[PDB]
Symmetry: D2
Subunit: 146 residues, 4 copies
């Protein structure tokens, strides 16, 4: 990732309004609903049979806050994502076997959640800057596969 001071400032500014506790659960639950093959990594979380089953699932919600916490930390360390995600990359690639494409899907779901939450404040250059970050994060997490 290479953001201009203006992109970075825009990015960190909007992120500060984010209720991660909330956005985390919405992003992960929407991933499971929209791209249903992703449910396979979470088959032990219980009932993932209906959109309601997914969205209010306590394990889904709890996990999404975790994922989002890691994301916030990538945002503060844009200069060393590879470093920052070093151990998470070994976990996902080596142990979990998460397809790199799935990281791209969650990135896109997150963008859509931000749009949904911020409406108007989520401008084209803000979306463009967010796309660069999510691609950057996806890249750092699939690191162990490169």
């Amino acid at each position: 990732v290479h953001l201009t001071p203006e992109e970075k400032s825009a990015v960190t500014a909007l992120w500060g309004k984010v209720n991660v506790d909330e956005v985390g659960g919405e992003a992960l639950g929407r991933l499971l609903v929209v791209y249903p093959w992703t449910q396979r990594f979470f088959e032990s979380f219980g009932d993932l049979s209906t959109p309601d089953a997914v969205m209010g699932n306590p394990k889904v919600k709890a996990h999404g806050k975790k994922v989002l916490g890691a994301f916030s930390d990538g945002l503060a360390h844009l200069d060393n994502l590879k470093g920052t995600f070093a151990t998470l990359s070994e976990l996902h690639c080596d142990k979990l076997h998460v397809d790199p494409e799935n990281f791209r899907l969650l990135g896109n779901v997150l963008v859509c959640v931000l749009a949904h939450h911020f409406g108007k404040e989520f401008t084209p250059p803000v979306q463009a800057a967010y796309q660069k970050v999510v691609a950057g994060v996806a890249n750092a997490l699939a690191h162990k596969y490169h």
Copy 2:
């Protein structure tokens, strides 16, 4: 596309509140801003060199309006997308040579614009439904390549 009537209905209902015109200009503009290589197809439209340049371009607005109108048409003819887009596919594949991936990015930008616009009424199952449609359209447009 496989839409449950519950899905067909939720889709239909919401498209009914869309401002095609506007959403069209928004979605097209955001594509060019977010996925800058797509500007190559619209070099003849004027200045696209700044996000402000892009969003301001009346050729971009007009065109996105044309794009969405075709979209509205695929929505009404969900069981005949290949036939409905017959003519558009030849144009895009044979003359313009639009990469199939680009149809997919536009579908993505369009889902984000509807989120951005509908906020709260843009629920997971609606998102899931729109996601199926957008994929169906992209597939129908790239058909000449298949």
Copy 3:
């Protein structure tokens, strides 16, 4: 898939020189080795910790044969793949949750295997004909998702 009769014939003739035994197993094994996340689907098959383990795995070799088997049968119905594969589609989408992307990676390995196997006979237009087919098979298998 729209193949010219010249394309259909080139497809048919090369296929007729293929040992599905040897190819199915080689392709399935190369998949697991080159795109390691795919192994997640085959944990019940035994050890896949090494390439050698992968390529040597009899359930792999044997699963491969079955996969090419099915393939060979869409070939006879390039006319209707969605219908040929309709039932394997429910299985993979509904029961197995195989990412659409995985189908495309297998299509890629299959193509590389043919190239590797029929060097100079695998000409540009023959390649072009096989890409349309593997892409057609992948879309047919991912259809329940659409």
Copy 4:
């Protein structure tokens, strides 16, 4: 990109046995033939209308050697593809506007040509290693986009 001691040596050895004239013209022609939309970047080259047109075209064979030429450096600097490819990245992203997906397609064609060009020395581990290289090169050329 990270290669095993072994993977590295196996990569470098096979490369010094490569006829870049041949591989370069074949990789580039195959790309144009297999994914026809790519023909839009080479409008300047003349007749690309047919596989024979394409494969016959010396502007094609000539650029293919240039492309592969650059690919060769990359290889001597696997530790810094990002740095090695920095200025080509600026040309491709800022000037030519080549979609990042196109770099991936060329990468794939390229691995197909190597398989075709070495049959049997192109083992599963060799493939895996070239796949990691090709992927790293594609990412290093799309670098100016993120």
